[PDB]
Design a protein around this ligand. Structure first.
Ligand code: ADP
Ligand code: MG
Length: 358
């Protein structure tokens, strides 16, 4: 006890966590990989909307030893903001450490604990990276829902879930108080994690990750989202972030499509004194993404000739209109609790973590 049980899925867009709440169920959220330097003091998922925290950790160095930061969404609106840099084709570690530690703190505050030991269950694209996380980290909230709260994080042990079925555990198992099998259900399989800026095409063969064939591409949803937003604004001539677009406009329609196959979705945007029906625009981009993913998945199927192909990530949901065809394809496996497809990997790491502590 006094222990936070979580799976940690960190990328360049978001830092994702799936953890056990007080009622023993899985709780998931994400913190954008964005930080900004902040003054020592104050100036669904509401508690992460304003993250102004002080972090004391030996995993940080230089003029970041022990100071205050704006983290995630609230950092994105700062001129100072630091984001992952990408060429036209470490020691930026605080970009990843800070949102990571922050997510641990937020989770701890959610379950009402001030001091948590956190066995690290994550993944990488081992011990060298784990030792970068070892030690004691204090996170103090200077604003927001948990203002004045001080959380002491202790990371003694961990794993990066490299080999075995650890990465795929969420395809078969859930945690409802703990620890049950999924309501519906080979030796060589591919896990395709369809993400925002990336697509992870991993191939597991005989209990082993095939490090040769396991590839990673920039085939994400963001480019297709960008295009849709270009055509919407152009249709008028609205949304602050892509997440805003996904949350306010897309997610409600996708959920309706999930829980009822006869439902045809509608997309209308209210901008100024004008309201436009842009259903055709959004659907075009969705299917374009689906078709492109269909093509990408097939040629990876052929390259590995895996027995089964598992498709996960938020891309499954964003392109559900087209990608739901995979449910009637033998050799393709969509998660059955498809509503939780975005947090598949972090949920897998969480389940692997609970099994470790048993
Ligand atoms: N329920 C949903 N409906 C529609 N789109 C979603 C849903 N959940 C996530 N997405 C979208 O799917 C894309 C992939 O998200 P995700 O896999 O979480 O990215 P990453 O793992 O790279 O951070 C994102 O653009 C996200 O906005
Ligand atoms: Mg991801």
């Amino acid at each position: 006890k006094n222990m936070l049980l979580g799976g940690f899925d960190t990328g360049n867009i978001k830092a994702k966590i799936s953890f056990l709440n007080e009622k023993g169920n899985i709780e998931s959220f994400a913190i954008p990989t964005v930080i900004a330097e902040a003054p020592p003091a104050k100036i669904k998922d509401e508690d992460i909307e304003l993250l102004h925290v002080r972090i004391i950790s030996n995993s940080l160095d230089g003029d970041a030893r022990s100071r205050a930061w704006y983290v995630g969404a609230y950092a994105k609106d700062q001129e100072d903001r630091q984001e992952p840099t990408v060429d036209e084709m470490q020691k930026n570690k605080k970009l990843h450490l800070i949102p990571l530690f922050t997510s641990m703190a937020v989770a701890a505050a959610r379950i009402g604990k001030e001091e948590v030991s956190v066995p690290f269950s994550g993944g990488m694209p081992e011990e060298q990276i784990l030792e970068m996380l070892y030690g004691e980290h204090t996170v103090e909230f200077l604003d927001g829902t948990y203002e004045g709260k001080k959380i002491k994080i202790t990371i003694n042990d961990g794993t990066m879930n490299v080999e075995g079925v650890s990465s795929v555990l969420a395809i078969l198992f859930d945690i409802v108080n703990g620890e049950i099998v999924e309501v519906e259900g080979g030796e060589s399989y591919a896990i395709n994690d369809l993400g925002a800026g990336t697509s992870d095409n991993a191939f597991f063969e005989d209990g082993e990750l095939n490090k040769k064939l396991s590839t990673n591409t920039d085939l994400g949803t963001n480019k297709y989202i960008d295009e849709i937003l270009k055509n919407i604004k152009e249709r008028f001539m609205p949304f602050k972030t892509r997440e805003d677009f996904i949350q306010r406009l897309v997610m409600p329609e996708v959920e309706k499509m999930i829980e009822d196959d006869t439902y045809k979705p509608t997309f209308s945007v209210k901008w100024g004194p004008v309201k436009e029906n842009v259903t055709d625009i959004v659907m075009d981009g969705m299917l374009k993404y689906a078709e492109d993913q269909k093509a990408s998945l097939d040629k990876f199927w052929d390259k590995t000739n895996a027995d089964k192909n598992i498709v996960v990530g938020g891309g499954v949901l964003f392109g559900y209109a087209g990608l739901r065809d995979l449910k009637e394809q033998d050799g393709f496996i969509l998660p059955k609790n498809i509503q939780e497809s975005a947090y598949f990997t972090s949920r897998s790491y969480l389940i692997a973590n609970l099994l470790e502590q048993l």
